[PDB]
Every structure is written in C-alpha cells, then in structure tokens.
C-alpha cells in the first residue's frame, strides 16, 4: 500500500502510473529526488485531484508561490499533496483510499513542471 517515486533534475517522474490494491484502506507515496539542483530552481511535488481540477490546481498552486510549496492552501480539490522539496529531500504523503471514487479521472503531478501521471484503483 506505498510506491516510491522520484523526481530528477530533468523534470521527469521515474513512473507515469501509480496503481492502488483495492485492499489498502490508506496509501502511501514516497517522493525523493536524486539530483543537485535546490528546491527554488528545481523543486517538485506530488500531487493529486481529479483530472478535471488539475488545471485549476496548477494555476492556484503557481499564483500562491513557493514558500506554499506552489499550492493553494486548503485547496479543497487537491485529494492528497506531498510538500516541494529539492535534491536529496524526501516527503510521504498518506491518503484514504475511499476517496477515490468509481468512475472518477484521478491525475498526479508535480504543479510548478510538465511532470503528471496516472493513478488507477487496481
Ligand atoms: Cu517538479
């Protein structure tokens, strides 16, 4: 009920799909982040909503800045986030798996790159 996932120094996630076991009542996403750059040239998160909210997700998150870690506070469309970090940081994020609801588009990204994925209940 985890997945490691990281993100480099060239705006690419090492997956573009996160799969959930059903069984898992709660999950967790453990982001890192090989590299040398710092956090305010190349910091990422990891972040999930529905398709349909990623954009305004993106754009709030971008006008809120980076001492918010380039979200929204309280974004009520933001299902679970990770906080920014740079090279050589680490953060997990743990959300409750009955959240993702049936027949719903659910994307994960990082909101300040081009850098997104998929995440599928199994
Ligand atoms: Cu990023």
Redesign the pocket.
Known sequence: CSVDIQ?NDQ?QFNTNAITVDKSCKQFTVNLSHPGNLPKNV????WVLSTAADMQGVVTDGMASGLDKDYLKPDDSRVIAHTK?IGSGEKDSVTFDVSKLKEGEQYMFF????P?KGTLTLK
Request: hydrophobic content about 35%.
């Open positions: 993100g705006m190349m910091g990422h998160n920014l990082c909101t300040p790159h850098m």
